[PDB]
Design an enzyme around this catalytic site. Structure first.
Site, PDB file in Angstrom:
ATOM      1  N   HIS A   1       0.815  -1.212   0.000  1.00  0.00           N
ATOM      2  CA  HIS A   1       0.000   0.000   0.000  1.00  0.00           C
ATOM      3  C   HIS A   1       0.851   1.266   0.000  1.00  0.00           C
ATOM      4  CE1 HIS A   1       0.333   0.029   4.548  1.00  0.00           C
ATOM      5  NE2 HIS A   1       0.266   1.335   4.354  1.00  0.00           N
TER       6      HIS A   1
ATOM      7  N   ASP B   1      -0.049  -7.563   1.606  1.00  0.00           N
ATOM      8  CA  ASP B   1       0.355  -6.155   1.645  1.00  0.00           C
ATOM      9  C   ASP B   1       1.874  -6.020   1.718  1.00  0.00           C
ATOM     10  OD1 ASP B   1       0.090  -3.412   1.558  1.00  0.00           O
ATOM     11  OD2 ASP B   1      -0.385  -3.196   3.693  1.00  0.00           O
TER      12      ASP B   1
ATOM     13  N   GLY C   1       2.818   6.579   8.767  1.00  0.00           N
ATOM     14  CA  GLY C   1       4.095   6.648   8.090  1.00  0.00           C
ATOM     15  C   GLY C   1       5.134   5.657   8.558  1.00  0.00           C
TER      16      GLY C   1
ATOM     17  N   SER D   1       4.437   2.188   8.495  1.00  0.00           N
ATOM     18  CA  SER D   1       4.281   0.911   7.809  1.00  0.00           C
ATOM     19  C   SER D   1       5.588   0.570   7.098  1.00  0.00           C
ATOM     20  CB  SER D   1       3.121   0.956   6.813  1.00  0.00           C
ATOM     21  OG  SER D   1       3.409   1.762   5.688  1.00  0.00           O
TER      22      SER D   1
HETATM   23  C1  LIG Z   1      -3.777  -1.114  -2.393  1.00  0.00           C
HETATM   24  O1  LIG Z   1      -3.320  -2.438  -2.219  1.00  0.00           O
HETATM   25  C2  LIG Z   1      -3.393  -2.881  -0.890  1.00  0.00           C
HETATM   26  C3  LIG Z   1      -3.134  -4.360  -0.554  1.00  0.00           C
HETATM   27  C4  LIG Z   1      -3.211  -4.844   0.897  1.00  0.00           C
HETATM   28  C5  LIG Z   1      -3.555  -3.819   2.013  1.00  0.00           C
HETATM   29  N1  LIG Z   1      -3.628  -4.295   3.405  1.00  0.00           N
HETATM   30  C6  LIG Z   1      -3.950  -3.340   4.452  1.00  0.00           C
HETATM   31  C7  LIG Z   1      -4.024  -3.828   5.909  1.00  0.00           C
HETATM   32  C8  LIG Z   1      -4.203  -1.856   4.087  1.00  0.00           C
HETATM   33  O2  LIG Z   1      -4.494  -0.920   5.093  1.00  0.00           O
HETATM   34  C9  LIG Z   1      -4.333   0.432   4.598  1.00  0.00           C
HETATM   35  C10 LIG Z   1      -3.199   1.042   4.627  1.00  0.00           C
HETATM   36  C11 LIG Z   1      -2.769   0.836   6.095  1.00  0.00           C
HETATM   37  C12 LIG Z   1      -2.060   1.725   6.899  1.00  0.00           C
HETATM   38  O3  LIG Z   1      -2.527   2.780   7.213  1.00  0.00           O
HETATM   39  N2  LIG Z   1      -0.769   1.278   7.464  1.00  0.00           N
HETATM   40  C13 LIG Z   1      -0.151   2.208   8.409  1.00  0.00           C
HETATM   41  C14 LIG Z   1       0.716   3.324   7.827  1.00  0.00           C
HETATM   42  O4  LIG Z   1       1.475   3.970   8.492  1.00  0.00           O
HETATM   43  N3  LIG Z   1       0.620   3.552   6.412  1.00  0.00           N
HETATM   44  S1  LIG Z   1       1.590   4.799   5.811  1.00  0.00           S
HETATM   45  O5  LIG Z   1       3.029   4.556   5.989  1.00  0.00           O
HETATM   46  O6  LIG Z   1       1.325   6.053   6.521  1.00  0.00           O
HETATM   47  C15 LIG Z   1       1.082   4.938   4.072  1.00  0.00           C
HETATM   48  C16 LIG Z   1      -0.428   5.049   3.749  1.00  0.00           C
HETATM   49  C17 LIG Z   1       1.936   4.156   3.073  1.00  0.00           C
HETATM   50  C18 LIG Z   1       2.060   5.682   3.162  1.00  0.00           C
HETATM   51  C19 LIG Z   1       0.697   1.746   9.597  1.00  0.00           C
HETATM   52  C20 LIG Z   1      -0.593   2.466   9.834  1.00  0.00           C
HETATM   53  C21 LIG Z   1      -0.533   3.739  10.744  1.00  0.00           C
HETATM   54  C22 LIG Z   1      -1.643   4.477  11.072  1.00  0.00           C
HETATM   55  C23 LIG Z   1      -3.083   4.073  10.630  1.00  0.00           C
HETATM   56  C24 LIG Z   1      -3.899   5.269  10.082  1.00  0.00           C
HETATM   57  C25 LIG Z   1      -5.404   4.910   9.822  1.00  0.00           C
HETATM   58  C26 LIG Z   1      -5.514   3.694   8.843  1.00  0.00           C
HETATM   59  C27 LIG Z   1      -5.930   2.448   9.693  1.00  0.00           C
HETATM   60  C28 LIG Z   1      -5.878   1.167   8.842  1.00  0.00           C
HETATM   61  N4  LIG Z   1      -6.231   0.069   9.693  1.00  0.00           N
HETATM   62  C29 LIG Z   1      -6.732  -1.171   9.112  1.00  0.00           C
HETATM   63  O7  LIG Z   1      -6.788  -1.333   7.934  1.00  0.00           O
HETATM   64  O8  LIG Z   1      -7.162  -2.161  10.024  1.00  0.00           O
HETATM   65  C30 LIG Z   1      -7.594  -3.300   9.470  1.00  0.00           C
HETATM   66  C31 LIG Z   1      -6.477  -4.083   8.850  1.00  0.00           C
HETATM   67  C32 LIG Z   1      -6.594  -5.086   9.979  1.00  0.00           C
HETATM   68  F1  LIG Z   1      -5.480  -5.049  10.770  1.00  0.00           F
HETATM   69  F2  LIG Z   1      -6.976  -6.333   9.565  1.00  0.00           F
HETATM   70  C33 LIG Z   1      -7.742  -4.310  10.584  1.00  0.00           C
HETATM   71  C34 LIG Z   1      -4.445   0.969   8.335  1.00  0.00           C
HETATM   72  O9  LIG Z   1      -3.550   0.829   9.112  1.00  0.00           O
HETATM   73  N5  LIG Z   1      -4.201   0.931   6.849  1.00  0.00           N
HETATM   74  C35 LIG Z   1      -5.152   1.148   5.879  1.00  0.00           C
HETATM   75  N6  LIG Z   1      -4.131  -1.388   2.717  1.00  0.00           N
HETATM   76  C36 LIG Z   1      -3.808  -2.365   1.671  1.00  0.00           C
HETATM   77  C37 LIG Z   1      -3.730  -1.867   0.213  1.00  0.00           C
END
Ligand SMILES: COc1ccc2nc(C)c(O[C@@H]3C[C@H]4C(=O)N[C@]5(C(=O)NS(=O)(=O)C6(C)CC6)C[C@H]5/C=C\CCCCC[C@H](NC(=O)OC5CC(F)(F)C5)C(=O)N4C3)nc2c1
Ligand SMILES: [Zn+2]
Length: 198
Positions: free
Chosen positions: A76, A100, A156, A158
């Protein structure tokens, strides 16, 4: 039109989390302008060090972690993008949207974490601000924060590692579980799921 179709830039290393000493701290190695140019060319001549890199695209920033010779991060964040390197864009070695997860060969000069075989549930999440956050493992791919905090503090990070007490890699952070904006738990790709992919 086909003549005007653009290509997405490469993921670019813009810094690292320094874990070499007594104190964890973030270091920036490239500013936004140089990041933009390096994303377009895919050439990055900067020396790479350490295990946890801060990486950026044109629109997102996140972390990438070297484990067993592979720089791992989340789909992602990176999508199918190449990563910039001294000799040009490097194509992904691993891609799994179902986990992911993506990975590239680890950069020259990086250090890799060792995959954990301790079977411990007392973990430590490393964020892009070099916070070291205790996490109790709660499942194959989930752990609870010992001190919840607003999701803003995890955004940020992840692609960052969860580590065991001995400093081995247990997993790659991918998502946060929150209630009213407070992060209570995290989800991560377990290292065994990486080791299977390898
Ligand atoms: C498109 O193809 C794909 C394929 C497979 C994917 N698989 C996943 C799980 C996914 O999830 C997205 C992105 C990720 C995220 O935000 N990652 C963090 C992050 O920091 N990103 S980031 O670096 O800022 C950025 C966007 C890269 C620049 C670490 C978290 C930090 C704060 C959360 C903010 C609110 C968001 C809460 C949310 N929660 C949640 O989804 O909970 C449920 C999943 C569960 F656990 F089953 C329950 C959450 O975390 N996400 C939402 N997108 C996918 C997309
Ligand atoms: Zn271990």
């Amino acid at each position: 039109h086909m003549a005007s179709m653009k290509k997405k830039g490469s993921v670019v290393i813009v810094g690292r989390i320094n874990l070499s000493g007594d104190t964890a701290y973030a270091q920036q190695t490239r500013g936004e302008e140089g990041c933009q140019e390096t994303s377009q060319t895919g050439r990055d001549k900067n020396q790479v060090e350490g295990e946890v890199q801060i990486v950026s695209t044109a629109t997102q920033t996140f972390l990438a972690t070297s484990i067993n010779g592979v720089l791992w991060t989340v789909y992602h964040g990176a999508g199918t993008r190449t990563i910039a390197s001294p000799k040009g864009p490097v194509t992904q070695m691993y891609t799994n949207v179902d986990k992911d997860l993506v990975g590239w060969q680890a950069p020259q000069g990086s250090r890799s974490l060792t995959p954990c075989t301790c079977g411990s549930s007392d973990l430590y999440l490393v964020t892009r601000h070099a916070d070291v956050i205790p996490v109790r493992r709660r499942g194959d791919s989930r752990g609870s924060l010992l001190s919840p905090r607003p999701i803003s503090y995890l955004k940020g990070s992840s692609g960052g590692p969860l580590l065991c007490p001995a400093g081995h890699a247990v997993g790659i952070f991918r998502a946060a579980v929150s209630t009213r904006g407070v992060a209570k738990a995290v989800a991560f790709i377990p290292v065994e799921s990486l080791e299977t992919t390898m």
